[PDB]
């Protein structure tokens, strides 16, 4: 505690409808950083517009994969060292597909946006601070996949 409990309580709301909330996360992401759009290359083709991504089964499967990684982080919030090796290889995979490490800061802001809009009154400054810390720890582990 105390960050721990704020994370578990707030995630309970989001995890009721993961694809709907993850849709908000990625809509926001492309609004902030449109140059992330070409990195989702399924069947060797590029999405033209952000709304094109929302029709792609492969893209929606990636939303589910994202939400499952965040769920594992919440389940393990008391000790994240258990996920470190997995997160390092997840970083390496994203480096491989072309994501720059700086772009994970925009992902974090999109995550915070999605929580603010979902929780409304209930997304307190303490809750924000807890999620920033948890997300920061996840990215620090992933960052090792970009060497060092
Ligand atoms: C700008 C942000 C991101 C981009 C452009 C991106 C793109 C991709 C791409 C192209 C793949 C490979 C194809 C696929 O499996 O759908 C992938 C795999 C994956 N991504 Fe992401 N991703 C991003 C962020 C994230 C985040 C934040 C997470 C989790 C916290 C995540 C979790 C995954 C997982 C679990 C896989 C499967 C990895 C594997 O092969 O084992 N991604 N991502
Ligand atoms: Ar997170």
Swiss-Prot record:
Tissue and organ expression note: Predominantly expressed in brain.
EC number: 1.7.-.-
Catalytic activity: Fe(III)-heme b-[protein] + nitric oxide + H2O = Fe(II)-heme b-[protein] + nitrite + 2 H(+)
Location of this chain's protein in the cell: Cytoplasm, Cytosol; Mitochondrion matrix
Top EC category: oxidoreductase
CDD domains reported for this sequence: Ngb (cd08920)
Domain named Globin: residues: 1-147
GO molecular function, one term: oxygen binding
Record's comment on post-translational modification: Phosphorylated during hypoxia by ERK1/ERK2. Phosphorylation regulates the heme pocket hexacoordination preventing the association of His-62 with the heme metal center. Thereby, promotes the access of dioxygen and nitrite to the heme and stimulates the nitrite reductase activity. Phosphorylation during hypoxia is stabilized by 14-3-3 proteins.
Induction behaviour: Up-regulated upon oxygen-glucose deprivation.
GO biological process, one term: oxygen transport
Gene Ontology CC: one annotated term: cytosol
Binding site for heme b: 62, 94
Keyword terms: Cytoplasm, Disulfide bond, Heme, Iron, Metal-binding, Mitochondrion, Oxidoreductase, Phosphoprotein
Main location: cytoplasm
PANTHER family recorded: BLR2807 PROTEIN, NEUROGLOBIN
Complexes and interactors: Monomer. Homodimer and homotetramer; disulfide-linked. Mainly monomeric but also detected as part of homodimers and homotetramers. Interacts with 14-3-3 proteins; regulates the phosphorylation of NGB. Could interact (ferrous form) with G-alpha(i) proteins (GTP-bound form).
Family under the similarity heading: Belongs to the globin family.
Function: Monomeric globin with a bis-histidyl six-coordinate heme-iron atom through which it can bind dioxygen, carbon monoxide and nitric oxide. Could help transport oxygen and increase its availability to the metabolically active neuronal tissues, though its low quantity in tissues as well as its high affinity for dioxygen, which may limit its oxygen-releasing ability, argue against it. The ferrous/deoxygenated form exhibits a nitrite reductase activity and it could produce nitric oxide which in turn inhibits cellular respiration in response to hypoxia.
The name this protein goes by in its record: Neuroglobin
Native organism taxonomy: Eukaryota, Metazoa, Chordata, Craniata, Vertebrata
């Amino acid at each position: 505690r105390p960050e721990s409990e704020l994370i578990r309580q707030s995630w309970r709301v989001v995890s009721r409808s993961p694809l709907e909330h993850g849709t908000v996360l990625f809509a926001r992401l492309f609004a902030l950083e449109p140059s992330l759009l070409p990195l989702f290359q399924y069947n060797g083709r590029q999405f033209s517009s952000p709304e094109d991504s929302l029709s792609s089964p492969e893209f929606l499967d990636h939303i589910r994969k994202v939400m499952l990684v965040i769920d594992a982080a919440v389940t393990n919030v008391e000790d994240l060292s258990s996920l470190e090796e997995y997160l390092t290889s997840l970083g390496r995979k994203h480096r491989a597909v072309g994501v720059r490490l700086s772009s994970f800061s925009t992902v974090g802001e999109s995550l915070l946006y999605m929580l603010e809009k979902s929780l409304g009154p209930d997304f307190t400054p303490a809750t924000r601070t807890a999620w920033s810390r948890l997300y920061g720890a996840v990215v620090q582990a992933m960052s090792r996949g970009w060497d060092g």
